Amino acid sequence: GDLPEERHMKVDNKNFYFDIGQNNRGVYMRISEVKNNFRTSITIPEKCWIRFRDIFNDYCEKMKK
Amino acid sequence: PEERHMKVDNKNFYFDIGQNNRGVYMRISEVKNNFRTSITIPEKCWIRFRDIFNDYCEKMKK
Ligand SMILES: [Cl-]
């Protein structure tokens, strides 16, 4: 089917973007960190989105609530 | 927090927790070939960041 749609987050003075793409090796998630005039990103292949999500729950559960 | 790692194909992801005067942050580095990039996420948005990522995990198929 079509890919999930673009998403955005704002924190402090920077913006985060999430977009989905696909090539011959497959589907991936690009997470960009964009500031007024700086830009860097990471690229996560689909086959490890779950592994990623789990690491995050682990960090979120272990927060000083 | 502890700090973790993960391998996929030709890439390594590292998860490090750091701290400055303003508070705690999580830095996610990507290393492939011999290049590395990273994004850094302050604690105050870990939940929102988790949910957004989780929503993407909810859309996936087979
Ligand atoms: Cl998908």
Residue numbers in the entry:
A (entry chain B): 191 to 255
B (entry chain A): 194 to 213, 214A, 215 to 255
Paper text:
Pur-alpha is an ubiquitously expressed, multifunctional protein that binds to both DNA and RNA and is known to regulate replication, transcription, and translation. It has been shown that Pur-alpha binds to single- and double-stranded nucleic acids that contain GGN motifs. Nucleic acid-binding of Pur-alpha is mediated by three central PUR repeats, which are N-terminally flanked by unstructured, glycine-rich sequences and C-terminally by glutamine- and glutamate-rich regions. Besides its ability to bind RNA and DNA, Pur-alpha possesses dsDNA-destabilizing activity in an ATP-independent fashion.
To understand the role of the third repeat of Pur-alpha for DNA/RNA binding, we determined its crystal structure. The final structure model was obtained in the same way from selenomethionine-derivatized crystals at 2.6 Å resolution. Two molecules (one depicted in brown, the other in yellow) of repeat III form a dimer with intertwined α-helices, very similar to Pur-alpha repeat I-II. PUR repeat III was previously suggested to mainly mediate dimerization of Pur-alpha. We therefore performed EMSA and observed that Pur-alpha repeat III bound with weaker affinities to CGG repeats and to MF0677 than Pur-alpha repeat I-II. Also in fluorescence-polarization experiments, PUR repeat III bound MF0677 ssDNA over 30-times weaker than PUR repeat I-II. Although Pur-alpha repeat III does not have a phenylalanine in the corresponding position of F145 of PUR repeat II, it also contains a conserved aromatic residue (Y219), which could potentially undergo stacking with DNA bases and support dsDNA unwinding. However, in unwinding assays almost no activity was observed for PUR repeat III. These observations confirm that PUR repeats I-II mediate the main nucleic-acid-binding and unwinding activities and suggest that repeat III might predominantly mediate dimerization. Since in the crystal structure the C-terminal end of PUR repeat I-II is located on the opposite side of its nucleic-acid-binding surface (bottom), it is unlikely that PUR repeat III causes steric clashes interfering with the nucleic-acid binding by PUR repeat I-II.
